[PDB]
Amino acid sequence: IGPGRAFYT
């Protein structure tokens, strides 16, 4: 399963 982004750059 793939990764999820939780924080913005």
Next chain:
Amino acid sequence: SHSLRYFVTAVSRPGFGEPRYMEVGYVDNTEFVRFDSDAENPRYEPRARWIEQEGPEYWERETRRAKGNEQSFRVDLRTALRYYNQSAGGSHTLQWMAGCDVESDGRLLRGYWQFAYDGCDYIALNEDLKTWTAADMAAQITRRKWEQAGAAERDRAYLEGECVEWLRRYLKNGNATLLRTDPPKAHVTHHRRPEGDVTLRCWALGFYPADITLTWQLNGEELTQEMELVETRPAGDGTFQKWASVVVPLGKEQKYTCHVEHEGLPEPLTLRW
């Protein structure tokens, strides 16, 4: 060892709407899933036959997570324009690679979680899975925000947890193709050149996985500076090709040996024309 990796790209196109967002997933050297925002009814999709066994929840859930990721990258692209004081008129590319390398006892060996902006390293999670390396000024802003937010701990949970468990499970369910080995079929071709000498080209064809070592020797000494090689290339049917060549004097071809090492060979091959 085996790996599960996701390759993510967002490219802005001012004047032609929202940026293009793409994800591609791989197990070792095999692509098995993809998402493309430009497609119609954009959906996480099978690109290997062993993955199409998963029920609609797998696809629903991965389409949700891709679409959420897409929104994050839209915001990240405009944040980059403020960090670097760039006009909103130009196109820019943000890339992300995350995944895990696992030994074959189910034990993690390295996690990856790294980004690049317009083709250069931006920030990467270090191999302790706890600290970041920031390429420049702007990335150091991101570093300090991610340090305060505890980002590494959450991203490390994915690499240590579901990336290892889902890899292990993809390997079982796609065993027939993923844990196959195809040895190279190798041979040497001989070509006369217009100024008197000879090209010998050592071919390795139809092999899997992609890693391979191809070298030429003259009387037992390796020709490390003289060899020409091509980048390993897909045949398009799941296997790969590579060749290595040397230029040798006419009448001395039988003094040269090509050596092939590959996971599919019990012993390296030595070939001679």
Next chain:
Amino acid sequence: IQKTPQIQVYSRHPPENGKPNILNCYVTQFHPPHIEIQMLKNGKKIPKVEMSDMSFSKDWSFYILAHTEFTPTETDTYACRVKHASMAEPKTVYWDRDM
């Protein structure tokens, strides 16, 4: 940073004339991802060409594979032409059956 594509043009099986085969045009090492790839037979565009999904490498450069069915002959010439913002001209690479 911008990098110009590298191109390999090659058959999927050992070429023999009169026998059906697959011709590949493998384009690597380019950045940004915007690219146009055409495969040509005697200077004319081949209509059905299949494109893989594009991905990228360890160094972040992109790569993609285009391919089409073909039956090589003694007289037809094949090439792949690539247009990328890193070059002023499109780059054409002709198929050499020994490469």
